Amino acid sequence: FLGFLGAAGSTMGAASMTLTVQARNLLSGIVQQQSTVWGIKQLQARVLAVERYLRDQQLLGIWGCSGKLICCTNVPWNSSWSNRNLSEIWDNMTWLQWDKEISNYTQIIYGLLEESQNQQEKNEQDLLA
Amino acid sequence: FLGFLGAAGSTMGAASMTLTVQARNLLSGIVQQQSTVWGIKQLQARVLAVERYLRDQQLLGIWGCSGKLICCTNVPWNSSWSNRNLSEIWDNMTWLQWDKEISNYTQIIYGLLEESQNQQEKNEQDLLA
Amino acid sequence: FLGFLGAAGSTMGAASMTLTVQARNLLSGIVQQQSTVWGIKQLQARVLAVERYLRDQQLLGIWGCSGKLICCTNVPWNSSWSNRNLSEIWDNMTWLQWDKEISNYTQIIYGLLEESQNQQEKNEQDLLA
Amino acid sequence: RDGGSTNSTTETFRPGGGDMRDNWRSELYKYKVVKIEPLGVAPTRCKRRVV
Amino acid sequence: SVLTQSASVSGSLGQSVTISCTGPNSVCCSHKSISWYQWPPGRAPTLIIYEDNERAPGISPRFSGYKSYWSAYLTISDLRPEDETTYYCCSYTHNSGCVFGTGTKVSVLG
Amino acid sequence: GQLVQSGAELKKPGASVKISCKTSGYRFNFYHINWIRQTAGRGPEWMGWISPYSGDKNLAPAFQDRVIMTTDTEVPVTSFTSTGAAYMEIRNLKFDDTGTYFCAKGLLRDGSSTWLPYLWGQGTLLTVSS
Numbered sequence: 001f002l003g004f005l006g007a008a009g010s011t012m013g014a015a016s017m018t019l020t021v022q023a024r025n026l027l028s029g030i031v032q033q034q035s036t037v038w039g040i041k042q043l044q045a046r047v048l049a050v051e052r053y054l055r056d057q058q059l060l061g062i063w064g065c066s067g068k069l070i071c072c073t074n075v076p077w078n079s080s081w082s083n084r085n086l087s088e089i090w091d092n093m094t095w096l097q098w099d100k101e102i103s104n105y106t107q108i109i110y111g112l113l114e115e116s117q118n119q120q121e122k123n124e125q126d127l128l129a
Numbered sequence: 130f131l132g133f134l135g136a137a138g139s140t141m142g143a144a145s146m147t148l149t150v151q152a153r154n155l156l157s158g159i160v161q162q163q164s165t166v167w168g169i170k171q172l173q174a175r176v177l178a179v180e181r182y183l184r185d186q187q188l189l190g191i192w193g194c195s196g197k198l199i200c201c202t203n204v205p206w207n208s209s210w211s212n213r214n215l216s217e218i219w220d221n222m223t224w225l226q227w228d229k230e231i232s233n234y235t236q237i238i239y240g241l242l243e244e245s246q247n248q249q250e251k252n253e254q255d256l257l258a
Numbered sequence: 259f260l261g262f263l264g265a266a267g268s269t270m271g272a273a274s275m276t277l278t279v280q281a282r283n284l285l286s287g288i289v290q291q292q293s294t295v296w297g298i299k300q301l302q303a304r305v306l307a308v309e310r311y312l313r314d315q316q317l318l319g320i321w322g323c324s325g326k327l328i329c330c331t332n333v334p335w336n337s338s339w340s341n342r343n344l345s346e347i348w349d350n351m352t353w354l355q356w357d358k359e360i361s362n363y364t365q366i367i368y369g370l371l372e373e374s375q376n377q378q379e380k381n382e383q384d385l386l387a
Numbered sequence: 388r389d390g391g392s393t394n395s396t397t398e399t400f401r402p403g404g405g406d407m408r409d410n411w412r413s414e415l416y417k418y419k420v421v422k423i424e425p426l427g428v429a430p431t432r433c434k435r436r437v438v
Numbered sequence: 439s440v441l442t443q444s445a446s447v448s449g450s451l452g453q454s455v456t457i458s459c460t461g462p463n464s465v466c467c468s469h470k471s472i473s474w475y476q477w478p479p480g481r482a483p484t485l486i487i488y489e490d491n492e493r494a495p496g497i498s499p500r501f502s503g504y505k506s507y508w509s510a511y512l513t514i515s516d517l518r519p520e521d522e523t524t525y526y527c528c529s530y531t532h533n534s535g536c537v538f539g540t541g542t543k544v545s546v547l548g
Numbered sequence: 549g550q551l552v553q554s555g556a557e558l559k560k561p562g563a564s565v566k567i568s569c570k571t572s573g574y575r576f577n578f579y580h581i582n583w584i585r586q587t588a589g590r591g592p593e594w595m596g597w598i599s600p601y602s603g604d605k606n607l608a609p610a611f612q613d614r615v616i617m618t619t620d621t622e623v624p625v626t627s628f629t630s631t632g633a634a635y636m637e638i639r640n641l642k643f644d645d646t647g648t649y650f651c652a653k654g655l656l657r658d659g660s661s662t663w664l665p666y667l668w669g670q671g672t673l674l675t676v677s678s
C-alpha cells in the first residue's frame with residue numbers, strides 16, 4: 001500500500017485497483033477548540049469538504065451508482081471522445097493525463113449516464129405483469 | 130426538455146418522466162469571495178440546502194431507496210388515502226394538487242414504508258441455510 | 259415501541275429488531291430565528307451532526323452497504339476478536355458491553371470489510387464475457 | 388468545613404459561595420452529554436451473495 | 439424420579455462413553471429440552487449442556503449431547519481422569535423447573 | 549461473577565430457617581435466581597426461581613406453601629455488574645429436608661432457557677435434628 005494519491009503517477013489500472021485509499025482519505029474531521037478569524041476559517045472549510053463530497057455522491061446516485069467506487073453503464077463509448085484502444089489507455093496513461101484528454105467531453109458523458117439510468121428505471125416501472 | 134420545475138403544471142406522469150431535471154438542479158455550489166452580514170447569510174444558506182437534501186436522502190435510505198429517483202415498496206395503497214383510479218391520478222392531476230390531497234396521510238405512508246423495508250431486511254437475515 | 263435508545267439495556271437481538279428508531283431519530287432540523295454567541299453555537303452544532311452522519315454513511319458505502327441498516331459481508335469472524343458463541347452474544351449481552359468488548363478490534367474489522375468489498379467489485383469488473 | 392482539628396471531637400460548618408460554577412453544578416447534577424456511535428459490528432452466520 | 443438414567447458407566451482413557459436419559463412421554467423427549475450437568479457429590483454443579491446439544495460457554499468439544507424421540511444422550515469423547523465423576527440430565531421446558539434424572543457415575547479406568 | 553450464600557444453620561424439626569444469597573460480579577437485576585436442593589435420600593430437587601427485576605416467582609408444587617423467596621433491589625457497582633441479595637425461607641422443617649441448598653444465576657437474558665441455573669453459589673447446609 002502506497003497511501004493517499006500514491007498511485008497518481010501509476011498506470012490507470014494500477015491506480016484503479018487502489019482507488020479506495022484515495023476515496024476514503026477524502027473526508028477528515030479535525031475536532032476543535034475554538035470555543036475569531038481562525039474560527040471563521042475552520043468553519044468555512046468544514047462546509048466545503050462535505051459539500052464537494054455530497055456533490056460527487058449526488059452525481060454518483062443520479063447515474064445509478066450510489067454504492068460508490070466501481071459501476072458500469074449502458075452508454076457506449078463514442079469513438080470521438082478518444083481513439084485509443086484498451087491496452088493503451090489502461091497501461092500507458094495515468095488518470096491525470098486521461099482526465100486532461102477527456103475533459104472536453106466529460107459533461108456529455110455525464111448526461112448520457114443520467115439518461116441511460118432514467119430509461120432503465122422507466123423500464124423497471126414497466127417491468128411488472 | 131423544459132427545465133427546472135418546467136413540468137409543474139403538467140400531468141403527474143408527464144412530470145414523472147422528467148423528475149431527474151428537478152432532482153439534479155436541486156443542489157448548487159456558488160463559490161465565494163467573502164474573504165460581514167452578507168458572509169453570515171451565505172454561510173447560513175449553504176448549510177440549509179444540503180441539510181434538506183440529506184434529510185431527504187435519509188428518508189430515501191430508511192425506505193430501501195438510497196439509490197434515489199424511482200423505487201417500489203411492499204406497502205398496499207389503502208383506499209382511505211385517495212379513492213381515485215390510476216388514469217385519473219396520472220393523467221388528470223399535477224403533483225402539486227396531489228401532494229395537497231395526500232398531505233393528510235403522508236407520514237403514515239412513510240411509516241408503512243420504513244416498517245415494510247425493515248421486515249424485508251429481517252427476512253434477508255433469515256434467508257440463509 | 260419504546261423510543262429513541264429505548265432498547266439500550268435490551269439484549270442485542272431485541273435492540274437489533276428496532277435499530278431503525280435510533281437510526282432515524284439521529285438527524286433533527288430545529289429551524290431558526292437567529293436573524294450572537296447563541297447563533298455561533300447553533301451554526302457550529304448544525305455542522306457536526308450531519309458531519310458524523312456523513313462519516314458513518316461514508317463508512318457504510320465503502321463497505322458495500324450504502325443502503326444502510328443491515329448488511330452482510332464476506333469477512334469471516336476471526337475467533338481472536340471474541341470467543342463467545344451466537345446464543346451468548348445475541349441473548350446475554352447488550353450492544354454497549356459488546357462494543358466495549360470489540361473496540362480493541364473494530365478498525366481491523368472495518369479494513370477487512372472494505373477490502374472484501376473492493377475484491378468483490380474487481381470480480382464484478384471481471385464478470386463479463 | 389474548617390481546618391481539621393482534633394479528629395471526631397467537633398465539626399464546624401461555615402457557609403460560602405466562593406464560585407458561581409457550583410450553582411451550575413447544583414442544577415446540572417442530573418444531566419450528562421454523550422455522542423451516539425451508531426456503528427456496531429457483530430457476528431452472524433451470514434455471507435453476502437457470491438459474485 | 440420418572441426420568442431414568444443408566445445407574446453406572448465406565449470408560450477407558452482416551453475413549454468415549456455415553457450416558458442415557460429416558461422416561462415416560464410426559465417427561466421425554468420430543469418438544470422437551472434436556473440439559474446436562476457435571477455434579478460431583480458434595481459440591482455445586484457445572485453446566486455442560488443446554489438446549490439438548492448446545493454446550494455451555496467454555497465447555498470442551500469432547501462433550502456432546504443428542505436427543506432422539508425415545509431418549510436423550512450425553513457423549514464424552516477422549517476420556518480424561520477429570521471426567522470420572524457423577525453426571526445428571528435434566529428435563530425442562532420453560533415454565534417448569536428442572537426435573538433431574540436418576541444419575542450416572544462415570545469411572546475412568548486405565 | 550460470584551454468588552455467596554449464607555453459611556450453615558441447625559434447626560429443629562417444625563422450625564423455620566432463612567438462607568441468604570448475596571451476589572456480585574454481574575447485573576443482579578437481569579438473571580433469574582433459582583433455588584435448588586440436594587438431599588441424600590431423594591437426590592437433586594429443583595425448588596423454584598424468582599426474578600430480581602420483576603419480582604415474578606415460579607415455585608415447584610411441592611414447595612409452593614412453605615417456601616418464601618424474596619430479593620432485594622440491586623446495588624450498582626459499575627454499570628455492567630452489581631451486588632444483590634436473595635433470600636429463601638423454608639418452614640415446617642422435617643428430617644427429609646436436611647441437605648444442601650443452592651441459589652443459582654440464570655443462563656441467558658432471552659431465549660429458550662432464560663432461568664436455567666448457570667452460575668451456582670457455594671451452597672448452604674441445612675440440618676434438621678433434635
Ligand SMILES: *[C@@H]1O[C@H](CO)[C@@H](O[C@@H]2O[C@H](CO)[C@@H](O[C@@H]3O[C@H](CO[C@H]4O[C@H](CO[C@H]5O[C@H](CO)[C@@H](O)[C@H](O)[C@@H]5O)[C@@H](O)[C@H](O[C@H]5O[C@H](CO)[C@@H](O)[C@H](O)[C@@H]5O)[C@@H]4O)[C@@H](O)[C@H](O[C@H]4O[C@H](CO)[C@@H](O)[C@H](O)[C@@H]4O)[C@@H]3O)[C@H](O)[C@H]2NC(C)=O)[C@H](O)[C@H]1NC(C)=O
Nearest residue numbers: 001002005006007008009010011012013014015091092094
Ligand atoms: C513508475 O514508473 C516506472 C516506469 O514506468 C514503473 O516501472 C514499470 O513498472 C511496470 C509495472 O509496474 C513494469 O512492467 C512489469 O515489469 C516487471 C519487471 O520486469 C522483470 O524483468 C527484468 C528482466 O529480468 C531478466 O534479467 C535479470 C537480470 O537483470 C534476470 O535475473 C532475470 O531472470 C531475467 O532474465 C528484471 O530485471 C526486473 O527486475 C527489476 O524489478 C524487480 C521487481 O520486479 C526488482 O527486484 C529488480 O531489482 C529490478 O529492479 C523484473 O524482474 C515484470 O515482472 C512485469 O511482467 C509481469 O507482470 C505483468 C503485470 O504487471 C503481467 O501482465 C506479466 O504477464 C508478467 O507476469 C511487467 O512487465 C515495467 O517494466 C517498469 N518499468 C518501465 C515501464 O520502464 C513503476 O512501476 C512506476 N511506479 C509507480 C508507483 O507508479
Ligand SMILES: *[C@@H]1O[C@H](CO)[C@@H](O[C@@H]2O[C@H](CO)[C@@H](O[C@@H]3O[C@H](CO[C@H]4O[C@H](CO[C@H]5O[C@H](CO)[C@@H](O)[C@H](O)[C@@H]5O)[C@@H](O)[C@H](O[C@H]5O[C@H](CO)[C@@H](O)[C@H](O)[C@@H]5O)[C@@H]4O)[C@@H](O)[C@H](O[C@H]4O[C@H](CO)[C@@H](O)[C@H](O)[C@@H]4O)[C@@H]3O)[C@H](O)[C@H]2NC(C)=O)[C@H](O)[C@H]1NC(C)=O
Nearest residue numbers: 130131134135136137138139140141142143144220221223
Ligand atoms: C398544459 O395544459 C394543456 C391543457 O391541459 C396541455 O395540453 C394537453 O396536452 C395533452 C398531452 O400533452 C393532450 O393530449 C394529447 O393530445 C394530442 C394532440 O391532439 C391532436 O389532435 C388534434 C385534432 O386533429 C384533427 O384535426 C386536425 C385539424 O385541426 C387534422 O389536421 C388532424 O388530421 C385531425 O383530424 C390536433 O388539432 C392537435 O393539434 C394540436 O397539437 C399539435 C401537436 O400535437 C400542434 O402541432 C397543432 O398546431 C395543435 O396545436 C393534435 O395533433 C394527441 O396527439 C395525444 O394522443 C396521443 O398521445 C397520447 C399520449 O399523450 C397517447 O396515449 C395516444 O394514444 C396518442 O398516441 C393526446 O391525446 C391534450 O389534447 C392537450 N389539451 C388539452 C388537455 O386541452 C399541455 O400539454 C400542458 N403543458 C404543460 C407543459 O404542462
Ligand SMILES: *[C@@H]1O[C@H](CO)[C@@H](O[C@@H]2O[C@H](CO)[C@@H](O[C@@H]3O[C@H](CO[C@H]4O[C@H](CO[C@H]5O[C@H](CO)[C@@H](O)[C@H](O)[C@@H]5O)[C@@H](O)[C@H](O[C@H]5O[C@H](CO)[C@@H](O)[C@H](O)[C@@H]5O)[C@@H]4O)[C@@H](O)[C@H](O[C@H]4O[C@H](CO)[C@@H](O)[C@H](O)[C@@H]4O)[C@@H]3O)[C@H](O)[C@H]2NC(C)=O)[C@H](O)[C@H]1NC(C)=O
Nearest residue numbers: 267268533578579580599601602604605657658659660662
Ligand atoms: C430488562 O431486563 C429484564 C431482565 O433481564 C428483561 O426481562 C427478561 O426478558 C426476557 C425476554 O424479554 C425474558 O425471557 C422470556 O421470558 C418470558 C416470560 O416468562 C413467562 O413465564 C413465567 C412463568 O409462568 C409460569 O407461572 C405462572 C404463574 O406465575 C403461570 O400462570 C404460567 O402458566 C406458568 O406456569 C411467567 O411468570 C412470566 O410472566 C411475567 O411476564 C409476563 C409477560 O410475559 C407478565 O404478564 C407477568 O405479569 C410476569 O411479569 C412469563 O409469562 C417468556 O415468555 C419467553 O419465552 C418465549 O419467548 C422467547 C423469545 O423471547 C422464545 O424463544 C420462547 O420459545 C418462548 O416462546 C422468554 O423466556 C426473561 O424471562 C425476562 N427476565 C429475566 C431475564 O430475568 C426485560 O425484558 C428487559 N427489558 C428491556 C426493555 O431491556
Ligand SMILES: *[C@@H]1O[C@H](CO)[C@@H](O)[C@H](O)[C@H]1NC(C)=O
Nearest residue numbers: 076077078079080081105108
Ligand atoms: C459521437 O460523436 C460525434 C461527434 O461528436 C457525434 O456527431 C455523434 O452523434 C456521436 N454519437 C454517435 C456517433 O453515436
Ligand SMILES: *[C@@H]1O[C@H](CO)[C@@H](O)[C@H](O)[C@H]1NC(C)=O
Nearest residue numbers: 205206207208209210234237
Ligand atoms: C386503512 O385506513 C383506515 C382508515 O384510516 C384504517 O381504519 C385501516 O386500518 C387502514 N388499513 C386497512 C384497511 O388495511
Ligand SMILES: *[C@@H]1O[C@H](CO)[C@@H](O)[C@H](O)[C@H]1NC(C)=O
Nearest residue numbers: 334335336337338339363366
Ligand atoms: C486472527 O487473529 C490472530 C490474532 O490477532 C491473527 O494472528 C490471525 O492472522 C488472524 N486471522 C486468521 C487466524 O485467519
Ligand SMILES: *[C@@H]1O[C@H](CO)[C@@H](O)[C@H](O)[C@H]1NC(C)=O
Nearest residue numbers: 337341342343494495496497
Ligand atoms: C463457540 O464457543 C467455543 C468455546 O465455548 C469456541 O471454541 C468455538 O470456537 C465457538 N464457536 C463455534 C463452536 O462455532
